[PDB]
Design a binder for these strands. Structure first.
Ligand SMILES: [Mg+2]
Ligand SMILES: [Mg+2]
Lengths: 96, 107
DNA sequence: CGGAATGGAATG
DNA sequence: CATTCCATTCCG
């Protein structure tokens, strides 16, 4: 029972067709968004029902992702990892 | 009109006589005081907002354009009271309709 | 104080 | 569960 957000994110990051704007970091334990504006206008509304970077980022925080602090946005969750989709089962949406 | 909750809450809080020992209008009615930060933060803030941090309250004040009123110290017996004064020109005693003019800065 | 990261909870 | 608004927290 893995939420759509996570399997879509995983597919989106992993897809080579989108790697110019969103791709795995070299060590495969975090991912990069490039050219936010382009990414928000062109990519997000193909996967989700919006075109707002801020809405995407909220979801990331809700699922426990943390920003990696350095137009290049990097995010990270330890059980969100290249080549290991089975680990998405351990990522939980934060309740209250 | 479409006034944010922060501002109507702040206005009501400052104006309420029940809270005047910790937060009240200045005599001229164009600024307000917070006394005893610690007690105010623990006992008052979480009844009106979703936290008990003075810093978080002050952040919202800055986001809506409020400025500190600067108290000048002098020498003395000069005992001081925990007293912070804030101010916005369209935030005034007895005149709630003016809140419409106070706008949040953009993030 | 204020930029920016993260959160609450109402609404979709 | 997702999306939005803007409030709260973190940290320089
Ligand atoms: Mg990709
Ligand atoms: Mg009062």
């Amino acid at each position: 029972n893995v939420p759509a957000f996570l399997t879509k994110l995983w597919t989106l990051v992993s897809d080579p067709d989108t790697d110019a704007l969103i791709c795995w970091s070299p060590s495969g334990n975090s991912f990069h968004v490039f050219d936010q504006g382009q990414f928000a206008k062109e990519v997000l509304p193909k996967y989700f029902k919006h075109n707002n970077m801020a809405s995407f980022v909220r979801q990331l925080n809700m699922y426990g992702f943390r920003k990696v602090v350095h137009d290049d946005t990097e995010f990270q969750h330890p059980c969100f990892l290249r080549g290991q989709e089975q680990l998405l089962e351990n990522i939980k949406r934060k309740v209250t």
